[PDB]
Amino acid sequence: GFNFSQILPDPSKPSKRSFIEDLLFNKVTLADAGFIKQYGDCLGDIAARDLICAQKFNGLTVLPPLLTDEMIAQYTSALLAGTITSGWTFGAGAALQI
Amino acid sequence: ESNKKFLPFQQFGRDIADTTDAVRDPQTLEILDITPCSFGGVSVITPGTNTSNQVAVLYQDVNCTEVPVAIHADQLTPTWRVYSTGSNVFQTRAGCLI
Numbered sequence: 588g589f590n591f592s593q594i595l596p597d598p599s600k601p602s603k604r605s606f607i608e609d610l611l612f613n614k615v616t617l618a619d620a621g622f623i624k625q626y627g628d629c630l631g632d633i634a635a636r637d638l639i640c641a642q643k644f645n646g647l648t649v650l651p652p653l654l655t656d657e658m659i660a661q662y663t664s665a666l667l668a669g670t671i672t673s674g675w676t677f678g679a680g681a682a683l684q685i
Numbered sequence: 686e687s688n689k690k691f692l693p694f695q696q697f698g699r700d701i702a703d704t705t706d707a708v709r710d711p712q713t714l715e716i717l718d719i720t721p722c723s724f725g726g727v728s729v730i731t732p733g734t735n736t737s738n739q740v741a742v743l744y745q746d747v748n749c750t751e752v753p754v755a756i757h758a759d760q761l762t763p764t765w766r767v768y769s770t771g772s773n774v775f776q777t778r779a780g781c782l783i
């Protein structure tokens with residue numbers, strides 16, 4: 588009778604994100620972006636008067652993370668699908684169902 | 686070329702780091718835009734000199750439709766002329782890998 592539909596992933600999206608996770612993604616707005624491959628941009632264009640081009644033109648870069656946002660979602664889905672079908676036992680050995 | 690409307694008493698245009706990024710040509714009264722030519726970081730991938738002396742080279746945040754004229758390819762030794770253009774070229778989000 589318990590309904591875990593809003594926190595488990597849905598296959599319709601192109602990612603493994605649940606309904607709460609993309610609600611959480613669309614509330615952390617960025618004061619500056621990261622990498623949009625803005626290096627073809629900022630050269631020769633007139634809309635180069637944002638923040639990131641003036642930073643990048645003085646030696647200041649941003650390196651990408653090692654785990655993407657689609658691997659962290661797989662990790663938190665594998666952590667959540669073991670608690671439901673095993674309980675407290677999968678973090679001490681083998682997953683015993685109950 | 687630009688869309689900037691210079692007033693008739695102005696010659697140059699500055700930005701948030703106090704560098705000229707717009708100029709007026711002193712013969713035809715038109716407004717050009719200035720942008721530095723491309724740069725970035727260079728990191729070397731090695732398996733350790735014990736195992737081999739064969740390396741790979743990553744060019745950060747660029748494309749490799751723009752690498753071999755940036756690095757001094759024909760100006761330098763043949764040994765930097767295998768890691769500038771070859772058959773092993775892969776495009777990743779951390780720059781493209783050669």
Ligand SMILES: *[C@@H]1O[C@H](CO)[C@@H](O[C@@H]2O[C@H](CO)[C@@H](O)[C@H](O)[C@H]2NC(C)=O)[C@H](O)[C@H]1NC(C)=O
Binds near residue numbers: 590591592
């Ligand atoms: C768990 O809760 C969700 C959300 O309330 C239920 O999803 C709804 O399913 C009905 C089907 O009868 C749809 O008409 C609604 O549009 C769905 N809501 C949403 C937000 O998608 C789901 O059915 C519940 N699980 C069970 C087993 O009842």
Ligand SMILES: *[C@@H]1O[C@H](CO)[C@@H](O)[C@H](O)[C@H]1NC(C)=O
Binds near residue numbers: 711714
């Ligand atoms: C000389 O300067 C004038 C300024 O308007 C320009 O129109 C003209 O083309 C110039 N002549 C040259 C560069 O021979």
Ligand SMILES: *[C@@H]1O[C@H](CO)[C@@H](O)[C@H](O)[C@H]1NC(C)=O
Binds near residue numbers: 624627748750776
């Ligand atoms: C640079 O590479 C990216 C990824 O392949 C591509 O989307 C972009 O169009 C490229 N820039 C060019 C071809 O000027």
